[PDB]
Design a protein around this motif. Structure first.
Motif, mmCIF file in Angstrom:
data_model
loop_
_atom_site.group_PDB
_atom_site.id
_atom_site.type_symbol
_atom_site.label_atom_id
_atom_site.label_comp_id
_atom_site.label_asym_id
_atom_site.label_seq_id
_atom_site.Cartn_x
_atom_site.Cartn_y
_atom_site.Cartn_z
ATOM 1 N N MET A 226 1.536 6.211 -5.596
ATOM 2 C CA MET A 226 0.503 6.568 -6.578
ATOM 3 C C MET A 226 0.026 8.086 -6.561
ATOM 4 O O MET A 226 -0.675 8.458 -7.543
ATOM 5 C CB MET A 226 -1.105 6.079 -5.883
ATOM 6 N N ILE A 227 0.744 9.066 -5.737
ATOM 7 C CA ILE A 227 0.865 10.414 -6.125
ATOM 8 C C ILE A 227 1.585 10.599 -7.551
ATOM 9 O O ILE A 227 1.299 11.576 -8.277
ATOM 10 C CB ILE A 227 1.032 11.331 -5.014
ATOM 11 N N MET B 279 1.711 9.304 -10.210
ATOM 12 C CA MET B 279 1.074 8.804 -11.380
ATOM 13 C C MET B 279 0.782 10.511 -12.234
ATOM 14 O O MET B 279 0.256 11.334 -11.772
ATOM 15 C CB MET B 279 -0.113 8.448 -11.336
ATOM 16 N N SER C 166 0.854 -1.254 0.023
ATOM 17 C CA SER C 166 0.114 0.048 0.146
ATOM 18 C C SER C 166 0.970 1.414 -0.132
ATOM 19 O O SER C 166 1.416 1.435 0.830
ATOM 20 C CB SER C 166 -0.841 -0.092 1.221
ATOM 21 N N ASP C 167 0.695 2.008 -1.140
ATOM 22 C CA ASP C 167 1.543 3.280 -1.117
ATOM 23 C C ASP C 167 0.900 4.328 -1.955
ATOM 24 O O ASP C 167 0.767 4.011 -3.178
ATOM 25 C CB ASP C 167 3.124 2.799 -1.815
ATOM 26 N N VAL C 168 0.817 5.415 -1.579
ATOM 27 C CA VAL C 168 0.277 6.611 -2.013
ATOM 28 C C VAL C 168 1.394 7.572 -2.609
ATOM 29 O O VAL C 168 1.208 8.177 -3.525
ATOM 30 C CB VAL C 168 -0.621 7.351 -1.166
ATOM 31 N N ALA C 169 2.660 7.400 -1.882
ATOM 32 C CA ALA C 169 3.764 8.070 -2.487
ATOM 33 C C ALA C 169 4.086 7.531 -3.890
ATOM 34 O O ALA C 169 4.632 8.015 -4.817
ATOM 35 C CB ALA C 169 4.916 7.910 -1.406
#
Lengths: 49, 49, 200, 59, 174, 59
Positions: free
Chosen positions: A33-34, A36, A28-31
Motif C-alpha cells: 500500500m505504500i 500506490m 495485510s500489507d503496507v509494502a
C-alpha cells in the motif's frame, strides 16, 4: 505468460528482477500500500495469460 | 493505482535484418491497472486521472 | 492435530527453500558439455542447451540425445563396461543429486575427433538426463508434500471462522512459491496468535 | 501497550478511539507497530479497511 | 593508575597477537569458482557485476553489515535460491555474496588492526607519562622499552622482558 | 632468591655482594637469571652499567 520474449519497463530498468513483481491479495500489507502511485515494484496477481 | 507500463520490444527475427531493422526497439505504451472510459464520471472527477 | 500439519507446512518449505538456496548449478558438467558442444560440430560440418537447470532442459536433453542419435546413426561403427560406467553412475546421480561425479571416459573407440568426443557426450548427456530429471522428481515430491498440506490448511479455514483463520487461507490458497511462501511464513505470528485462540 | 494503541488510532489512523470494541482493529494495530513509514497515513488507512473488509463477509 | 593501564597494554597486545595469528571456506571457494566461472576479490566483485528479489538483497546487505562487526562469528546465509536454473546466475549471485562478505571481512580486518595499533599507541603515551612519574629505575627502562611504535614480534618479546615493570609498580604504587 | 643474587653479583658481574644497597642493580638480576649466555661474563656487566648510567641523569 510469454512475456519472456519481451522486455518490460515501468522505470528505467526492465521489470525482470523478482522483487519488482510482487503478488499479494487479501493479506495485510503496507509494502503493498505504500506502492500506490509508485513504480518501484509492479504488483500483479497470477501473472499468466 | 493506474501505473502504466512501457514495452521495449524488438521484432520477429525474420524482420530483424538491416541497420534500421536490427537495432530497433518497438515501443508499446500500455496502461496497467487501467480501465477504459465511455464518458467522464461527474462525481469522481477529482479522484480520476 | 492442526498445528502438526501447520508445522510440516513450515517444515517442507524451510526444507525446500534450503535445497533451492543450495542448488547445485554444476560448473564442471557445464564446462565439459560446453567444451564438447563446441567440438562435435567441427566434425559434423565437414562430415569425415544452456541453463543446465531449466525445467525445459529435460526436453532439451531429450531432443539433443536424438540430435546425437541422428549423428551416431550417420557414423554407426564400444565396450560393455564403458556402457556400464555410463549407466551405473547415472542411476547414482539420480539418487545422489547433490554430488555429481565426472568420469574420464574409458576411451576404446576411434581416434577421430568425433568418436572420442561424441562418446563424451554419450556420457555427458545421460548425466544431464540424470541430474535434470531427478531434480524434478524430488522437487515435485517436495511440492506434492506441500500441496497435500494445502488441502490440510483449507481445512484450517474450515475451522471456527476467526479472522486469522480467513487470513490463514488467504495466505495459503496458492500453489508452491519460492519467494511468497517463505516471506509469508515470517508474517504469520498472527497464526501463532490464531491457533492458541483456536484450540488452546 | 494501550498508549501505543492510542498513537496509531489518533495520529496515524485519525479516528475516534473505539479500538478494543472491535477485535479486528485490535489485531491490526500491533502489526502496524512493527511497520515503519508512518508518514503515509492513507497507506495504513487503506490497508486497515481491506483487513476490516476481510472481517465481515458472507462468502 | 598505571597497573590498570599496564594490564590494559597486556590485554590489547595479546588481543592483537591472537588476531594477527588468525578464512578457508571464504578464500578457497571464491578462488576455485573464479577460475571456473582479496584485491583479486574486489576486481572479481567488479567482474561479477560485468558478468533477484528485494528481500534476498535485504538479507544480503544485513549479513554483510553484521559480520563486519561480528568478525569472529560469520553467518552463512547460504543462498536463498529464487533465481534462474542456469548454473552460472545462481553462481554469480552466490559469489557476489562471498565478494560482499569477504570485502566486509577485509574492511573489518583493517579497522580492527588499526584500532589495536591505535589503542596501544594511546597507552604508549600513558607509559611515557609513566616514565614521567617520580623517579624509579625501571621507570627509565619503562620508556626505553616503549618508545617504539607498535610492532608484532618486538613488543611481544618485550612483554616477557617487562618482568622488571611489575616489580616497578609494586615499588612505585604499592 | 638471595642465592641467585649472590650468584650473578659475585661470579658473573664479579663484585662483592652489595646488591640491595642500591636499587638499580637489584632489578637487573631477575632479568639476568632468565638470560642465557653466561660464558660471556662482560656483556652482562656492560648491559648492567648501561642501566646504572641511565639511573641518574639530568637530560
Amino acid at each position: 505468460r510469454n512475456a519472456n520474449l519481451v522486455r518490460v519497463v515501468a522505470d528505467d530498468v526492465p521489470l525482470d528482477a523478482a522483487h519488482i513483481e510482487e503478488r499479494n491479495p487479501g493479506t495485510s500489507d503496507v509494502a503493498r500500500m505504500i506502492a500506490m502511485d509508485q513504480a518501484e515494484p509492479l504488483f500483479v496477481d497470477a501473472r499468466r495469460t | 493505482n493506474a501505473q502504466m507500463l512501457e514495452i521495449r520490444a524488438a521484432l520477429d527475427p525474420a524482420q530483424r535484418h538491416g541497420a534500421p531493422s536490427a537495432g530497433f526497439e518497438s515501443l508499446q505504451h500500455v496502461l496497467y491497472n487501467g480501465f477504459c472510459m465511455t464518458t467522464v464520471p461527474k462525481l469522481l472527477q477529482e479522484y480520476l486521472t | 492435530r492442526e498445528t502438526q500439519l501447520y508445522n510440516e507446512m513450515v517444515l517442507w518449505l524451510r526444507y525446500h527453500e534450503k535445497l533451492t538456496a543450495r542448488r547445485p548449478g554444476h560448473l564442471p558438467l557445464l564446462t565439459r558439455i560446453r567444451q564438447d558442444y563446441d567440438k562435435l560440430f567441427g566434425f559434423v560440418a565437414a562430415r569425415p542447451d544452456d541453463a543446465v537447470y531449466g525445467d525445459d532442459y529435460v526436453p532439451r536433453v531429450d531432443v539433443f540425445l536424438r540430435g546425437l542419435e541422428d549423428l551416431a546413426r550417420c557414423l554407426c561403427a564400444m565396450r560393455a563396461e564403458e556402457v556400464n560406467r555410463l549407466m551405473d553412475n547415472v542411476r547414482d546421480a539420480a539418487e545422489r543429486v547433490l554430488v555429481y561425479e565426472v568420469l574420464d571416459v574409458r576411451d576404446p573407440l576411434n581416434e577421430d575427433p568425433s568418436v572420442l568426443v561424441h562418446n563424451r557426450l554419450v556420457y555427458l548427456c545421460r548425466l544431464a538426463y540424470a541430474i535434470s530429471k531427478s531434480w524434478q522428481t524430488l522437487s515435485h515430491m517436495c511440492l506434492d508434500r506441500i500441496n497435500s498440506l494445502r488441502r490440510r490448511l483449507i481445512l484450517a479455514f474450515h475451522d471456527r471462522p476467526a479472522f486469522a483463520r480467513v487470513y490463514a487461507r488467504n495466505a495459503l490458497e496458492r500453489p508452491v512459491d519460492g519467494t511468497t511462501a517463505y516471506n509469508l511464513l515470517r508474517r504469520l505470528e498472527e497464526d501463532f496468535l490464531l491457533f492458541r485462540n483456536a484450540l488452546r | 501497550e494501550e498508549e501505543r494503541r492510542k498513537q496509531f488510532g489518533a495520529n496515524v489512523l485519525n479516528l475516534a478511539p473505539a479500538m478494543v470494541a472491535q477485535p479486528v482493529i485490535s489485531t491490526m494495530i500491533p502489526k502496524y507497530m512493527k511497520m515503519g513509514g508512518h508518514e503515509d497515513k492513507l497507506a495504513y488507512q487503506l490497508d486497515l479497511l481491506r483487513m476490516l473488509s476481510i472481517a465481515k463477509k458472507a462468502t
